[PDB]
Amino acid sequence: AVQQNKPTRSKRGMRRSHDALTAVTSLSVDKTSGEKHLRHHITADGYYRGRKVIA
Amino acid sequence: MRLNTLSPAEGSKKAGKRLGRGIGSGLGKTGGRGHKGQKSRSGGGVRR
Amino acid sequence: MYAVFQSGGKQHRVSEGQTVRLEKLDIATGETVEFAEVLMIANGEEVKPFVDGGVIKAEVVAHGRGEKVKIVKFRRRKHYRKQQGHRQWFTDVKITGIS
Amino acid sequence: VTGSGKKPWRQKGTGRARSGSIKSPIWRSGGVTFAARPQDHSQKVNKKMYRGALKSILSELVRQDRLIVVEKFSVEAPKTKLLAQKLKDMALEDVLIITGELDENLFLAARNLHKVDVRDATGIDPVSLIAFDKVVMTADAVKQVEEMLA
Amino acid sequence: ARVKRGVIARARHKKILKQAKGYYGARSRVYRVAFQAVIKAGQYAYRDRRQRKRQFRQLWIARINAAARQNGISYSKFINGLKKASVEIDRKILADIAVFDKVAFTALVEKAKAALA
Amino acid sequence: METIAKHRHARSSAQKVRLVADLIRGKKVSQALDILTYTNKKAAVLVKKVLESAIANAEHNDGADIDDLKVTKIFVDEGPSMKRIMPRAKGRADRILKRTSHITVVVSD
Amino acid sequence: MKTFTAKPETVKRDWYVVDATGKTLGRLATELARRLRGKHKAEYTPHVDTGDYIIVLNADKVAVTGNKRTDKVYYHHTGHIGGIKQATFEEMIARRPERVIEIAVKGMLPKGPLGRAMFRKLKVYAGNEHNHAAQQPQVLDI
Amino acid sequence: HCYECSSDCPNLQPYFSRCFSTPVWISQAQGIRAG
RNA sequence: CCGGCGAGGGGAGUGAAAAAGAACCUGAAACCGUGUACGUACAAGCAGUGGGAGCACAGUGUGACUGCGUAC
RNA sequence: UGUAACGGGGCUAAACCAUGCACCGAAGCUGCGGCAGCGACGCUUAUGCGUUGUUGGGUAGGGGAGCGUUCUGUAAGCCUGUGAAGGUGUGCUGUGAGGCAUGCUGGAGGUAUCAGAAGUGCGAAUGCUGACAUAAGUAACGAUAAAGCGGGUGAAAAGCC
């Protein structure tokens, strides 16, 4: 329930081989306002798929 | 015959045992006292 | 054209114009030195006890000390430790003759 | 050390090393182990060892020509300027003057000069006869110093 | 005369961490681990100055044995045949010949095969 | 010309900030900006402030020309920890480390 | 003057082919391990793969003396608690007769990354024909 | 702006050294049977 | 100037010096990063040591493979 | 627990017995170079140094030599703003503790020598103090009475109004 030996710099970074965040690299431009947005999300100004939805 | 030229006679000054100061001195880790008994304690040693 | 001679308790195989490092010979720097005891001269044709008249003649280059070795003696749990350094004297000779 | 004799924690039970005083010398801010006391660093010198030394220093000062005997060394005014001249003609810079009389005119005139010391032939010592480049003695003073060293 | 010991304990520690370059992990950084890394590394260095002279004699003997057997004799009969012929070349040079001048080794084997039998 | 902007004593832990820093290491500074905009971390809001400041530190002082900037160096150091106390069960107390960090963005044409 | 060491680029391993019909197994298998390792060469150096590529042919016709055909058992364990499976020599000749030469040679090669690479140069075939005509293997007569 | 506050420890342990170490009252480990 | 009329930072300036900027002389070590060279994804164990390629630099660095080797 | 009673592979000799020869094999011996202790040497003419003999595994322990640190004298001396101590590298050389030179930081003090005095050398004492790791970005976020929306403000609102 507790370690017998302090793990190393090696094993601490080996565990964080999968802690690395994944960037999006998939921003989508809107066809009526040219805003980049998340795919299938509305824009910051409230356009979505060419239509003004939220305003 | 200046103050930085005067020496003692040879052998007039022996150094003095410094105990418990490492392996090379031959007096480390017990202080010349051996292992655990009455005589190796601080103040130990029987009377005359 | 190489030959085998034997100088500092060890045997060396040298060619012409080669420096070989030997044990510390006590001959001054710049003096020609003969090694009359040549074990085996070889070429396209080879000559092997000792040879009869082949002499390696060299020329003394330098008298240095070697890279320092650390001698560490250790006895675990027994309160014993001993360091010592060592630089070994050598003699470099450039080989100026294979007979 | 200012502190209480309270044992800091209990002897058993807590997993900390056993302690019994906050003023133990292993601890920070408590206790020098073999702490100093004011002591006397004087040594005994035998009189025949003290006199044998001074007879052996004065014998060596005439060997390395650092004893110069004068017959009078006195200066008229109690002025450091005159004595500063006193040894230029004498060709002295680091000197110890040893006189037999109680000359207070000469005594003040070397009180500011660092390398010049005036004595009274009875307080000359080991380290003063060595740490000066020339020792200059008046002839009345070398009569007394010859006497006390027999 | 109080003596602070930060300057010469730093230097004594720094001297040992400098001998521990290239060691893994805390054996290069931590003094307690790096001290007994360096003391063990000097212990091995003493021992393998003995083992170096054995490991190379092992390596020469294995190469003379191979190069004798290409010339049709074993190492034992080649070394016995050289001693009966009073040839005094050591095994360092006998192995040096065996890779660099093979025709100077087939002559040595012949001078051993002759004076043996 | 390398242009530095720093954010010292950033109140997020350095391991949390270093996750977001590896997203924008070497990227072009326009692409680095909207990686940090659609990253759902608190460190993403912190690092984007330094990058947007290094963008203005370049074009106000050293020169101009936003569009050829790149996030050349990006590295997170550990600032001084603020030490706090969480009380635990049975009288016990623990030390909480409010771990600060030092975000440094070096932008460069 | 340092002793020569062979290099793992300038070494040139030659291809040999061996007909293992009627040969005593570990008398065969120890000359294979000698030449897989490279101890028959004056250029031998114990940290470099200096050996040869040996093609063993007719592995199923390898011979053992005595009663070893029915009494030499091959023990392997599968990692599970039952585990200890075993096959005699004649069962091993029926199932995978290539394995008999390969097991015997593998115990005679050194243990480690290098001896595992010396095992890669032992091409063992149960039949009489290999595929390595392009490497032009010389006949190595045992 | 009045910053760089300290790490005010608990007012229980007067040796801040062990303040975050052990509670120093009772050590209950109860399963010991040696005979 | 960027920022939230922030915090922090980048300039400009002072000064011999701001890597003396107040969390301020010097600033070690543990510990934590970034950049670069080399090694590393079929290889078993006190992590070194002896041998040793290859590579990268201008001797240094790394260290495949390998012998011996169970800390204090 | 798994072959598990050649170390293994394997061996019908690679096993036993007898004989013989060769070889391998240690830090033993020899060679080569170095160093030290002890003697015998009058070898020298304080006697160093030489010549020969032989010895140098070591715990407890005894004996003999040193190294370095701080402080006093030598020191109103020498070094030092044309860069001290310290820190950090590198190189050189001592049998060792170590020593020296120097590139960069540092920005004002340091001390040949020979003596003198010791708070004189740390890896350990479940040592003491500070700092920082580790587990681990894990457990948890303290009553399972419960929240959802729309406005507002704001740099930002699940929590504020």
PDB file of N, CA, C and O in Angstrom, chain E residues 56 59-60 62-63 66-67 69-70 98-100 102, chain G residues 3-6 34 39-46:
ATOM      1  N   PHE E  56      42.859 -10.981 -22.321  1.00  0.00           N
ATOM      2  CA  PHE E  56      43.543 -10.852 -23.591  1.00  0.00           C
ATOM      3  C   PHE E  56      44.332 -12.095 -23.913  1.00  0.00           C
ATOM      4  O   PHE E  56      44.389 -12.497 -25.074  1.00  0.00           O
ATOM      5  N   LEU E  59      42.014 -14.275 -25.363  1.00  0.00           N
ATOM      6  CA  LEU E  59      41.658 -13.891 -26.723  1.00  0.00           C
ATOM      7  C   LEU E  59      42.748 -14.249 -27.723  1.00  0.00           C
ATOM      8  O   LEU E  59      42.445 -14.622 -28.858  1.00  0.00           O
ATOM      9  N   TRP E  60      44.015 -14.130 -27.331  1.00  0.00           N
ATOM     10  CA  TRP E  60      45.097 -14.533 -28.218  1.00  0.00           C
ATOM     11  C   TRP E  60      45.078 -16.031 -28.445  1.00  0.00           C
ATOM     12  O   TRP E  60      45.082 -16.484 -29.588  1.00  0.00           O
ATOM     13  N   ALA E  62      42.705 -18.132 -28.211  1.00  0.00           N
ATOM     14  CA  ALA E  62      41.588 -18.566 -29.036  1.00  0.00           C
ATOM     15  C   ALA E  62      41.806 -18.255 -30.510  1.00  0.00           C
ATOM     16  O   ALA E  62      41.237 -18.926 -31.372  1.00  0.00           O
ATOM     17  N   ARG E  63      42.617 -17.253 -30.821  1.00  0.00           N
ATOM     18  CA  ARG E  63      42.893 -16.888 -32.200  1.00  0.00           C
ATOM     19  C   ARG E  63      44.052 -17.666 -32.783  1.00  0.00           C
ATOM     20  O   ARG E  63      44.021 -18.015 -33.962  1.00  0.00           O
ATOM     21  N   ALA E  66      42.563 -20.979 -33.604  1.00  0.00           N
ATOM     22  CA  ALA E  66      41.841 -20.992 -34.859  1.00  0.00           C
ATOM     23  C   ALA E  66      42.787 -20.928 -36.035  1.00  0.00           C
ATOM     24  O   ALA E  66      42.611 -21.643 -37.021  1.00  0.00           O
ATOM     25  N   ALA E  67      43.805 -20.083 -35.944  1.00  0.00           N
ATOM     26  CA  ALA E  67      44.729 -19.923 -37.047  1.00  0.00           C
ATOM     27  C   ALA E  67      45.694 -21.082 -37.168  1.00  0.00           C
ATOM     28  O   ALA E  67      46.241 -21.295 -38.251  1.00  0.00           O
ATOM     29  N   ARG E  69      44.593 -24.163 -36.674  1.00  0.00           N
ATOM     30  CA  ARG E  69      43.747 -25.203 -37.228  1.00  0.00           C
ATOM     31  C   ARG E  69      43.413 -24.980 -38.689  1.00  0.00           C
ATOM     32  O   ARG E  69      43.011 -25.924 -39.371  1.00  0.00           O
ATOM     33  N   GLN E  70      43.568 -23.758 -39.187  1.00  0.00           N
ATOM     34  CA  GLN E  70      43.509 -23.557 -40.623  1.00  0.00           C
ATOM     35  C   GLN E  70      44.765 -24.087 -41.293  1.00  0.00           C
ATOM     36  O   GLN E  70      44.714 -24.534 -42.442  1.00  0.00           O
ATOM     37  N   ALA E  98      48.603 -13.635 -36.794  1.00  0.00           N
ATOM     38  CA  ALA E  98      47.574 -14.525 -37.311  1.00  0.00           C
ATOM     39  C   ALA E  98      46.462 -13.800 -38.053  1.00  0.00           C
ATOM     40  O   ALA E  98      45.788 -14.416 -38.881  1.00  0.00           O
ATOM     41  N   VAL E  99      46.261 -12.512 -37.804  1.00  0.00           N
ATOM     42  CA  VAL E  99      45.256 -11.775 -38.552  1.00  0.00           C
ATOM     43  C   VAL E  99      45.865 -10.847 -39.587  1.00  0.00           C
ATOM     44  O   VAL E  99      45.182 -10.494 -40.558  1.00  0.00           O
ATOM     45  N   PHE E 100      47.121 -10.454 -39.426  1.00  0.00           N
ATOM     46  CA  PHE E 100      47.695  -9.376 -40.212  1.00  0.00           C
ATOM     47  C   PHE E 100      48.634  -9.866 -41.289  1.00  0.00           C
ATOM     48  O   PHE E 100      48.660  -9.299 -42.379  1.00  0.00           O
ATOM     49  N   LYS E 102      49.133 -13.588 -42.506  1.00  0.00           N
ATOM     50  CA  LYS E 102      48.848 -15.005 -42.374  1.00  0.00           C
ATOM     51  C   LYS E 102      49.965 -15.860 -42.951  1.00  0.00           C
ATOM     52  O   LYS E 102      50.211 -16.962 -42.457  1.00  0.00           O
TER      53      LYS E 102
ATOM     54  N   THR G   3      45.374  -4.901 -29.454  1.00  0.00           N
ATOM     55  CA  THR G   3      45.053  -6.147 -30.127  1.00  0.00           C
ATOM     56  C   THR G   3      43.901  -5.921 -31.087  1.00  0.00           C
ATOM     57  O   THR G   3      42.970  -5.173 -30.781  1.00  0.00           O
ATOM     58  N   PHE G   4      44.013  -6.521 -32.273  1.00  0.00           N
ATOM     59  CA  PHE G   4      43.013  -6.434 -33.328  1.00  0.00           C
ATOM     60  C   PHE G   4      41.644  -6.871 -32.844  1.00  0.00           C
ATOM     61  O   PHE G   4      41.505  -7.893 -32.175  1.00  0.00           O
ATOM     62  N   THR G   5      40.624  -6.101 -33.191  1.00  0.00           N
ATOM     63  CA  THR G   5      39.247  -6.538 -33.032  1.00  0.00           C
ATOM     64  C   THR G   5      38.554  -6.451 -34.376  1.00  0.00           C
ATOM     65  O   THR G   5      38.757  -5.496 -35.124  1.00  0.00           O
ATOM     66  N   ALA G   6      37.768  -7.464 -34.693  1.00  0.00           N
ATOM     67  CA  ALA G   6      37.052  -7.453 -35.948  1.00  0.00           C
ATOM     68  C   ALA G   6      35.853  -6.537 -35.832  1.00  0.00           C
ATOM     69  O   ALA G   6      35.345  -6.281 -34.745  1.00  0.00           O
ATOM     70  N   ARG G  34      30.523 -24.023 -33.232  1.00  0.00           N
ATOM     71  CA  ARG G  34      31.867 -23.497 -33.408  1.00  0.00           C
ATOM     72  C   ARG G  34      31.931 -22.532 -34.579  1.00  0.00           C
ATOM     73  O   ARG G  34      32.559 -21.477 -34.488  1.00  0.00           O
ATOM     74  N   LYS G  39      34.663 -19.267 -34.169  1.00  0.00           N
ATOM     75  CA  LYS G  39      35.876 -19.667 -33.490  1.00  0.00           C
ATOM     76  C   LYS G  39      36.822 -20.419 -34.388  1.00  0.00           C
ATOM     77  O   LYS G  39      37.918 -20.753 -33.950  1.00  0.00           O
ATOM     78  N   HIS G  40      36.429 -20.700 -35.611  1.00  0.00           N
ATOM     79  CA  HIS G  40      37.302 -21.337 -36.574  1.00  0.00           C
ATOM     80  C   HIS G  40      38.097 -20.329 -37.369  1.00  0.00           C
ATOM     81  O   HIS G  40      38.863 -20.714 -38.250  1.00  0.00           O
ATOM     82  N   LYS G  41      37.932 -19.051 -37.072  1.00  0.00           N
ATOM     83  CA  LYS G  41      38.546 -17.963 -37.801  1.00  0.00           C
ATOM     84  C   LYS G  41      39.581 -17.288 -36.930  1.00  0.00           C
ATOM     85  O   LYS G  41      39.355 -17.075 -35.739  1.00  0.00           O
ATOM     86  N   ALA G  42      40.710 -16.916 -37.535  1.00  0.00           N
ATOM     87  CA  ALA G  42      41.730 -16.170 -36.817  1.00  0.00           C
ATOM     88  C   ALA G  42      41.246 -14.799 -36.403  1.00  0.00           C
ATOM     89  O   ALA G  42      41.771 -14.237 -35.449  1.00  0.00           O
ATOM     90  N   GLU G  43      40.239 -14.271 -37.081  1.00  0.00           N
ATOM     91  CA  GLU G  43      39.633 -12.981 -36.813  1.00  0.00           C
ATOM     92  C   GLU G  43      38.637 -13.011 -35.680  1.00  0.00           C
ATOM     93  O   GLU G  43      37.882 -12.048 -35.547  1.00  0.00           O
ATOM     94  N   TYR G  44      38.612 -14.077 -34.884  1.00  0.00           N
ATOM     95  CA  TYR G  44      37.606 -14.257 -33.849  1.00  0.00           C
ATOM     96  C   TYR G  44      37.721 -13.187 -32.778  1.00  0.00           C
ATOM     97  O   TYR G  44      38.815 -12.891 -32.296  1.00  0.00           O
ATOM     98  N   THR G  45      36.594 -12.591 -32.417  1.00  0.00           N
ATOM     99  CA  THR G  45      36.595 -11.664 -31.320  1.00  0.00           C
ATOM    100  C   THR G  45      35.253 -11.776 -30.606  1.00  0.00           C
ATOM    101  O   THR G  45      34.209 -11.798 -31.266  1.00  0.00           O
ATOM    102  N   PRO G  46      35.250 -11.934 -29.281  1.00  0.00           N
ATOM    103  CA  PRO G  46      34.109 -12.565 -28.617  1.00  0.00           C
ATOM    104  C   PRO G  46      32.895 -11.673 -28.452  1.00  0.00           C
ATOM    105  O   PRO G  46      31.876 -12.141 -27.944  1.00  0.00           O
TER     106      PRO G  46
END
